[PDB]
């Protein structure tokens, strides 16, 4: 498989869904013969610019390792989900853990 | 062309040109849900809107709206339906049901296909506009919540919404500019019908035109009576509209219900 690192920022007034969103994704990854060696909840915070309006959003990281196939399934559930304002996921670059 | 598969092009042998045929829909012969079809253009007496004739027809076929809901359809096979170039697919539900539908693009071989509020957003089945994102590409909507009219002309025919419009009304037909429509309505969401299906030329009247409609051409033809212009030594001069229709644009459709659509430019 190939490592990853996805940081999704969900709408500020939908934070309560963030915790639930994590379980789904995480569960899938685990059920995809993958691994999760990084995780952190940044919560809400001011933005550089009012990206997609407002001036704050909920941040979360990841840095998985699951097979590209199953992660490509994420872009869909990510797009078709007004909760999440912006999506941004880079490639492997070898397992990343702690710090951040 | 620009896609797959390209459209054959008959070679100069006996004044021959572009044709029309698909990749295939394996079989050459339909199901059973169909009527008999009317015949000519005439209105219980007089012709009415001249032009209209030629034989070869039958085959009604159906389905629209899609009252049925969350029950998994499976595309049985694409199929060719007369007069309207928008294919048709077949489709069977998980309870031996069998409507028809307007064959979207990526279809054929089985596929998902689901209707009802909250359903996979691909090109499966209709869905209340409400339960739809931007729908840069919806489908044969309905001016009303229950019907299925709109752009059934699938063939390349699309419609764009506007991400999230409130007030419960949106849509952007092709040349129809802008126009609001009850949001409690549903759209197939697929929105296709293959464009090239309408990218060949009939050929040479007869075996291509006649097999549909009569000589829809009358021109001046002179004879100041048969049409609001004629005679002359051999030319036209003046106005040439039939029944002072005034072919100089004019436009129509005034007052009454509707006419609450928007934007609409004039180039």
């Amino acid at each position: 498989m190939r490592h990853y690192e996805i940081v999704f920022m969900v709408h500020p007034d939908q934070s309560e869904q963030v915790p639930g969103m994590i379980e789904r994704y995480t569960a899938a990854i685990t059920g995809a013969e993958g691994k999760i060696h990084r995780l952190e909840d940044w919560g809400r915070r001011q933005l550089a610019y009012p990206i997609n309006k407002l001036h704050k959003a909920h941040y979360v990281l990841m840095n998985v390792e699951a097979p590209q196939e199953v992660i490509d399934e994420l872009e869909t559930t990510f797009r078709f989900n007004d909760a999440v304002i912006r999506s941004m996921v880079m490639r492997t670059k070898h397992a990343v853990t702690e710090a951040s | 062309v620009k896609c797959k598969p390209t459209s054959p092009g008959r070679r100069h042998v006996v004044k021959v040109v572009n044709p029309e045929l698909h990749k295939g829909k394996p079989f050459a012969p339909l199901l059973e849900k169909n009527s008999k079809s009317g015949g000519r253009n005439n209105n219980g007496r007089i012709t009415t809107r001249h032009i209209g004739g030629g034989h070869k027809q039958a085959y009604r076929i159906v389905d629209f709206k899609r009252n049925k809901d969350g029950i998994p359809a499976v595309v049985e096979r694409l199929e060719y339906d007369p007069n309207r170039s928008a294919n048709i697919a077949l489709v069977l539900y998980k309870d031996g049901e069998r409507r028809y539908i307007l064959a979207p693009k990526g279809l054929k071989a089985g596929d998902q296909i689901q209707s009802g509020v909250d359903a996979a957003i691909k090109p499966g089945n209709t869905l209340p506009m409400r339960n739809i994102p931007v729908g840069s590409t919806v489908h044969n909507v309905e001016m009303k919540p229950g019907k299925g009219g709109q752009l059934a002309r699938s063939a390349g025919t699309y419609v764009q919404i506007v991400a999230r419009d409130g007030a419960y009304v949106t849509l952007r037909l092709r040349s129809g500019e802008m126009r609001k429509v009850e949001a409690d309505c549903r759209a197939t969401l697929g929105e296709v019908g293959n464009a090239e299906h309408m990218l060949r030329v009939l050929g040479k009247a007869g075996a291509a035109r006649w097999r549909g409609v009569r000589p829809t051409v009358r021109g001046t033809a002179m004879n100041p009576v048969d049409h609001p212009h004629g005679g002359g030594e051999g030319r036209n001069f003046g106005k040439h509209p039939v029944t002072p229709w005034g072919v100089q644009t004019k436009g129509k459709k005034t007052r009454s219900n509707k006419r609450t659509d928007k934007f609409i430019v004039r180039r």
Partner: protein
Amino acid sequence: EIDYKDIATLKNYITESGKIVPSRITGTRAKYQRQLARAIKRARYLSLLPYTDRH
């Protein structure tokens, strides 16, 4: 440096205009300059850092 979360060690390689500071006044071994800029770009999407300044 190869990231964007380390927003802490970036505000130095910019200015009141959030513009990527040249390598002239940095001499950041070049090879690093390349990486340093790449971060400031992608990092701006996560609104972690600003693009312009007037808005």
